[PDB]
Amino acid sequence: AAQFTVLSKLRTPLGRAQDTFQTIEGIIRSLAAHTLNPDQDVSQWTTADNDEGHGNNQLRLVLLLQYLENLEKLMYNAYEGCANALTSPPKVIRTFFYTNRQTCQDWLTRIRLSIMRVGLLAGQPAVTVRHGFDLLTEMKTNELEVTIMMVVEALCELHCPEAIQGIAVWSSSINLLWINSVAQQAEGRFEKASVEYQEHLCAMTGVDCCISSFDKSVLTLANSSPEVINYLGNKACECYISIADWAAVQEWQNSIHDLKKSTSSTSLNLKADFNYIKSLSSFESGKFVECTEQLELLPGENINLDMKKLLPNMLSPDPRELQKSIEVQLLRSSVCLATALNWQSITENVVKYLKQTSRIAIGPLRLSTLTVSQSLPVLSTLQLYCSSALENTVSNRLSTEDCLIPLFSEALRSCKQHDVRPWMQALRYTMYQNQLLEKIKEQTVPIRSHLMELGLTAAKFARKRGNVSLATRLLAQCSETTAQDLVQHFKKWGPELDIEKTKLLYTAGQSTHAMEMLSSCAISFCKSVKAEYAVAKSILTLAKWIQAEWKEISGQLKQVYRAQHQLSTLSKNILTLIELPSIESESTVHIGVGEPDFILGQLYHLSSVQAPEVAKSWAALASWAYRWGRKVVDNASXXXXXXXXXXXXXXXXXXXXXXXXXXXXXXXXXXXXXXXXXXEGVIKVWRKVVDRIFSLYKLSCSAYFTFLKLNAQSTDDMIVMATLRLLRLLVKHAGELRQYLEHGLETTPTAPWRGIIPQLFSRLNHPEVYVRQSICNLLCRVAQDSPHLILYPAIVGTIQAMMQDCYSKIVDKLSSANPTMVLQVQMLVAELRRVTWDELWLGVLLQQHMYVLXXXXXXXXXXXXXXXXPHEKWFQDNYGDAIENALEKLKXXXXXXXXXXXXXXXXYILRLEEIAAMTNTEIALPGEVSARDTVTIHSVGGTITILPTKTKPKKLLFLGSDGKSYPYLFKGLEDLHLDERIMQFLSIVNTMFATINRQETPRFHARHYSVTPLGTRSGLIQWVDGATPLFGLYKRWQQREAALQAQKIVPRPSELYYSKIGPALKTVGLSLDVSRRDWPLHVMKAVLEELMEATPPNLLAKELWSSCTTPDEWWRVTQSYARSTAVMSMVGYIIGLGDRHLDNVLIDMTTGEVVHIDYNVCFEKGKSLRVPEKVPFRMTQNIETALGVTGVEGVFRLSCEQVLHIMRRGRETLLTLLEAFVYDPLVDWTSYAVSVWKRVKAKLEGRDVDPNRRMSVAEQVDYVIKEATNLDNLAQLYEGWTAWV
């Protein structure tokens, strides 16, 4: 319909071009006016004949908005155009829409204000958000506050506090301190938002309107225009209603009435049916008489004592009204059933009522599919589930498990992105059944456990968002206004309830009381029957809380330590917990280990022994032991004295004792030192002391091995860290603690080692004997049941005998299960290596022509001819006279003629038959690290394409069993060994975002491809599909502009830049012959400014908008793009990625994510070039506009801060991996690697640019953004970078 309207020059059956606009404008204005006053009763939009017409009204309202959205897109494409998103319309249409652009834009900006209200009414925040952003962008020259209000409300409905915060900062640069409060409410903090709203209202009116609430001192620690006043007043009521605080609602109503009567506002009025609120309060309080009496005033069919027309007339198409109607119907059914209990008397009519209610409640879920939303409504889903549960209990009389709401504790780890309202609705309908159980004499289903589970989960979610009052009420209900009250009232779900109470006490501010309660609870849990997950959780929580207050708790730990070798409540409790009866001695930790630090180790050991099935207990103990072991070993670089004195039957004894442990080939050095100092039983004491010093490493190794064995449950990020630590300790110290490493490696599984395989292969040249054997055995074992990860590396390596015997053994071991596969793999590798002739001859001739102006040339030519002796036959039959020509020219135009002929014949498409072809192959694809069900190669592409201007790349495709094509890129003489390390690093970084990705719609991810080297110079790189280069959009825009200007090729970036820098330099005195270094800064800034003003800054934004189908999809794609850009910007700045031109940045229109390809200018290599680069990442005009109206002030900055926080927390693993990359014999860095590692470490530690000052995450993000967005740095950049676009 939209296409027909645009293609007809707006001349539809509705009338002329103006009649259509007038009709749409009138309908939109009427609907918008009805939003302000819900009593307008718009004809054909608020009335229906039955319950089915009402759903149709909402459907029609959504369709109208979709039609307008498509019409605008088509008009824009008609007068401006796109780049592959939409097809160019005919010339006649383009000519008409180009001369009428002003009228079309004026009409749109004229109705944009009403469209936002209509979108807000229809429950489609995406429409109003997009329209608001478009309206704000045009406002570059009191309608500004209304737009901000609608935009903030829409963003609040979408649960996007980051965008709200960005908008607050953006608006602060134009009396808008109330936006932050809405941001707080968008995160689920209803208790704090109401207080902030009251504080703002008391200042915008001058009259105090506060109400009684929880202690404001601890509330903050746990987490003038009439329109603004009314908006804030209504939001406060909404916040109070969300947590179901009826008393607070009544108090707020009284306060609002008093404030209105004390200021004669005449415009401030709460828009909320209080009769419905009173009915809800009465129903929840158990007073069914008052509830049924109050329900008679609400609209709709009378309470049960036709079925199709249950909803009343004049109903607004607002989903909020539908939710209220459904709630009223549910309450009526519940009251009717309760009165009927005290089976077809009053059970026959209620079933039909509930069935109709359920049929109506599925409307919103159905509408959620018409628009690609990727998610279902939350309140609407629970309404339908509650109706189903009520229907089941009315017919089964609470006798089947289907009568309960399917809300369990499992939602704790899968629904962290939702507020507490769903739990409130579930609890409201569950308590009714619990109370109803008292009127059923027959057997029923146990609801007490379900109620306890729901209450505990609701309390946990309430505490996680600062709602102390709600959490207190829920905990009290489960247990059947000041912190002191909570302390005096709280100090299969027993242990969970106790731990939750302790956590709430800690959140309220009483850390000492919470610690004491946890200690008392742990002492009892350690003497329980099961206590599996209860002891570990309590001990780990107590240990974590102790580290927080390390300054105020260090004194107590010392006292408890001294008390053990011979006290407050917490100290005595800790003493009793560690002194419990069933491996760490004080002698091995009395050298450089702090006294309070030993208590933590004992606590970790106790947690690990009381719960051997918990992986967390082992990981914590292993980490603590490893850190202290490294510290004691670094710092160290009675029985012993008695043994030495007895075995040596005054200064000599002291010297010998000092030399025995001075700095412990070691045996020879010790013997020489002893002989030179004293002048053989010293070997026993020396061995005993060296073994005692390495006790921490042994304990850490045992704990790490146990943790890895328990993961054959825990995040892979921790697994990679443990494996890296074990490998590093085994490489560094191998002979001192070999007894543990040997057995552990011989018994450890092979699943947690699939992430450090390259490091294992790299450490195969260790200067030891059993170390190499152990690594080889581990790799051989990994090959079994998983040969797709050892096949290519072993085959390439086998194609210093230490680095050869291991590879041969691995290949032999892997060939014992499929010799045919190994042979085919070797044949394929050989064919690929030989498919890298004409190219060699051309290169040799070109090099000789330049190196000529003797015997070296003759020798090189002879070697090349000897090396060259389907495709080779043709080359030989066509140029076999080369040898004769070279021999005749030895005693020289033949070489020049051959080179010229080759160059002329060079100026792509090849065939596989002439350059063999297998089928039904069972070889793994080149790179299947993450593939549970590996796909084998099925065929090979019959054609090969050669990429021009980029050396000699070959695009080869591979067929799979899944009938899908997998493109690849073959490179010759590139040495892609370093790229593989970068790709592995990217995967390790992505590994740290697994936890945060479970409760965030826009996932934190860094797109990357696979790199498979095929030797020392060649390699196979994966091809990225679905992502287009950013330069394409600029090129298409240039072509469109040229075509438009032709009526009434395109220049290259260098040609366009010089054409402007020439006259500018000539107008000041200098000339083009002057060196680029000696160029005025003002001239460069002026040319950059002139170039930016000529290019449109919304190319990418418009392309992304035109690619999406619905507003919801547009919002999802925009958020995905912002988060991906932030993640890649921080990753690139941390590693030091450079050369970020338009051809190296790709964009996936399907999802909105970005992906980089070239990585040869990493590790700050772009800073030292002919034209140095001073920007950390690309933040040009087009990149910033695609982020929205606020730019880098909202989601981008916050996402960047989050990414930096995660990296700073997990920098240990990144540095460990980088160290391994540095010490790699297969990586060609050319102490450059040491400098690179130090630079990365400094950036990760926050000490990027500072002598001794350590910056913060926010400061670092701000500094990087400022350095990447300033015009002074973008002007003095290479012209090929295209800083103006």
Ligand SMILES: O=P(O)(O)O[C@H]1[C@H](OP(=O)(O)O)[C@H](OP(=O)(O)O)[C@H](OP(=O)(O)O)[C@@H](OP(=O)(O)O)[C@H]1OP(=O)(O)O
């Ligand atoms: O109360 P719980 O249900 O046990 O929640 C805890 C804990 O919550 P609190 O910090 O509010 O006490 C943390 O939840 P998030 O921070 O991830 O939202 C997190 O612990 P940390 O972040 O402090 O490490 C995680 O525990 P963990 O990360 O160790 O798995 C989690 O669940 P569990 O404690 O049950 O594991």
Ligand SMILES: Nc1ncnc2c1ncn2[C@@H]1O[C@H](COP(=O)(O)OP(=O)(O)NP(=O)(O)O)[C@@H](O)[C@H]1O
């Ligand atoms: N993984 C990839 N996926 C898709 N396209 C790619 C990939 N890698 C490179 N390309 C593109 O395919 C071509 C490969 O040629 P390439 O050799 O990378 O260009 P180049 O000028 O030599 N830059 P460089 O790679 O640093 O030498 C270029 O046009 C790249 O933009």
